[PDB]
């Protein structure tokens with residue numbers, strides 16, 4: 390009460406934050422490209438700005454937690470927090486981040502196959518694992534690992550990007566039980582996430598296996614996890630029947646197929662991440678080491 394705590398409201402003043410264009414839609418909000426030009430001389434820094442799509446009291450509270458999460462993270466493979474803009478005369482909140490020119494990893498794989506080979510895919514895989522190791526040290530569960538939520542700075546560097554679903558583990562437990570679910574990326578979910586609403590570092594590892602799958606399909610049409618799972622379930626199915634069949638499929642060892650051209654060793658990593666036994670999944674530290682040893686064990 391007596392003394393409130395707030396980010397520096399003069400760091401990014403709304404009157405110097407110039408809207409350039411929309412960048413995309415993410416968890417609970419949208420992202421725009423702006424220029425922050427306090428010397429109004431057509432210089433300044435380009436930045437990315439996240440804003441809520443539905444500014445309810447609950448969503449604003451969740452957004453504050455998301456902002457605090459990102460601000461607490463400093464890592465080469467996590468998108469950089471820059472600050473907050475208290476816009477609308479300090480009666481609104483927007484998140485300011487660094488601008489990463491190539492957008493989502495999902496879109497980069499589709500648009501820039503000319504400069505992607507397996508060496509680059511393994512490099513991105515390694516970087517993703519290291520960012521996830523770092524999140525683990527803060528007891529953060531990302532909860533939406535997918536190439537749509539990873540960002541590309543340049544052909545040599547990717548960064549985990551969208552923290553809209555991220556949760557902090559309770560102090561006394563190794564999982565977070567979500568008790569108000571909204572829109573769920575079910576084709577990235579671990580089985581215990583589908584059946585018990587339990588999220589953990591190990592469920593992030595499951596989803597990382599789907600990310601690895603995505604990388605090695607090169608976002609080829611018809612190979613995405615939704616398209617492949619729907620092909621296995623039956624493209625006709627609708628509503629909850631889809632979830633029922635997905636759960637039944639995963640519990641009895643149905644899995645995404647090996648992508649064309651994917652080495653058996655990379656597919657085996659995917660398979661080990663996709664273990665119904667939560668405790669037997671590898672750690673992100675195991676995965677970073679194994680992937681970097683594979684990379685290092687090539688000639689050169």
Ligand SMILES: C[C@]12O[C@H](C[C@]1(O)CO)n1c3ccccc3c3c4c(c5c6ccccc6n2c5c31)CNC4=O
Pocket residue numbers: 412413414415416419420437439468486487488489490491492493537538539540550551552
């Ligand atoms: C919504 C989304 O818009 C596109 C990619 C994206 O993640 C959607 O796939 N998107 C871009 C498309 C083309 C160029 C740049 C971006 C971009 C950026 C960010 C984000 C970001 C941060 C937090 C949540 C979502 C974010 N996006 C971002 C984003 C953060 N910094 C960015 O440069």
